[PDB]
Amino acid sequence: GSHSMRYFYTAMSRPGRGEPRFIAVGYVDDTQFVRFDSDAASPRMAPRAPWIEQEGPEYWDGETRNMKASAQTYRENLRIALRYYNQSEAGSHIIQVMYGCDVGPDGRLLRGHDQSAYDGKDYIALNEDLSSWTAADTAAQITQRKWEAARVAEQLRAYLEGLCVEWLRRYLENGKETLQRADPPKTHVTHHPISDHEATLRCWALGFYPAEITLTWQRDGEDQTQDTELVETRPAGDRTFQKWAAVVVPSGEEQRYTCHVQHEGLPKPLTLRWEP
């Protein structure tokens, strides 16, 4: 199917406690594959998935030098942001960055991304054309003018359409036994009496990859959107994810309820019901 590569940077000031911490992680789809942490005893871009370990020392040295460069740039950006927002040097602030590329089944670019946030709020984003910018406020408009003057979007576009897509294709091949394998959910329905009058039906999905999944409850074929409790999809720790959806049902009416599961790994969507 389709695939994505993403890098995430977080820069975190801490006045009085040293320089801002810089952490970067890289992902293909829902699989983390590299990390960098300026607070490590010896900071380096480090492998976090088995199929990246085969990259040679030139790769790791180049990535480490780039993250050290980025750490310095984002430490400076934190100082700049204080000036742009008239903020004091005593508070702790955060810059976040996400960028990368999406490709279709044939490996062609679908969409590129490059977005930044300040203190958890959107700051500036490269538009889908990979040539213009959307700035969130008058501070980000200064950055926008700076980046328009220096033709920063042209460099991002070249990266996103070129190296980003080419390295994603390489990683997908090197890690094809996992990155290109969907693990379908293992599913079952449980039943928990609440009172004489009601019971909970909980529809479980376990051990699936990738994380994207749809779990719904129907009653008499009608979606129970407002009355379903849906937990956030959560990592199991072994690559896979977990999710459940629950409804409170009148005693004896259990069989009017059906659970519907959709996942990339399933040839057809599943309909489940409680089976005492």
């Binding site: 890098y7 970067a24 890289g26 871009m45 790769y59 180049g62 990535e63 780039n66 993250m67 460069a69 980025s70 310095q72 740039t73 400076e76 950006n77 700049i80 942001a81 742009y84 960028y99 200064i142 950055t143 700076k146 980046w147 220096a150 920063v152 460099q155 991002l156 990266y159 190296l163 980003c164 390295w167």
Partner: peptide
């Protein structure tokens, strides 16, 4: 592979 830091900055 990460994008080369060009360090124009904000």
């Amino acid at each position: 592979t990460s994008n080369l830091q060009e360090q124009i900055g904000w």
